[PDB]
Amino acid sequence: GSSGSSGMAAGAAEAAVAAVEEVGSAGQFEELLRLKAKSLLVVHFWAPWAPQCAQMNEVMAELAKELPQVSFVKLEAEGVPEVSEKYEISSVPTFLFFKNSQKIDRLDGAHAPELTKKVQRHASSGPSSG
Numbered sequence: 644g645s646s647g648s649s650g651m652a653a654g655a656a657e658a659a660v661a662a663v664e665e666v667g668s669a670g671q672f673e674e675l676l677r678l679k680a681k682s683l684l685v686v687h688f689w690a691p692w693a694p695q696c697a698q699m700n701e702v703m704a705e706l707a708k709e710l711p712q713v714s715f716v717k718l719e720a721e722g723v724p725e726v727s728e729k730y731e732i733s734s735v736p737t738f739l740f741f742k743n744s745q746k747i748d749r750l751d752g753a754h755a756p757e758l759t760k761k762v763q764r765h766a767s768s769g770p771s772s773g
């Protein structure tokens with residue numbers, strides 16, 4: 644109960660990844676929400692049956708690269724019925740824009756262009772604004 648920071652210590656780094664994260668549990672998602680609160684989180688619902696999720700998945704990969712300040716996470720609707728229940732997500736494809744641990748936007752249906760639009764729109768918030 645007595646210390647003197649005397650400034651600030653140095654021992655932390657940060658990297659940049661443009662890959663789609665795989666969410667297979669509510670904990671991971673509910674947890675990330677906070678972490679990726681400042682940034683733009685994109686929760687896409689992919690299914691091992693729905694063909695639409697096929698192309699919708701490939702498109703994401705690219706985006707993630709274009710927008711390094713964005714977070715693309717894909718969750719299994721049937722894989723994790725815990726989260727799907729809460730939001731009652733019983734349809735795919737389905738994207739959920741979570742900002743600051745609070746849903747602000749949502750895209751229903753397999754839309755290649757419609758998606759990018761929303762992604763960029765929100766993605767804006769952050770560095771190099773514009």
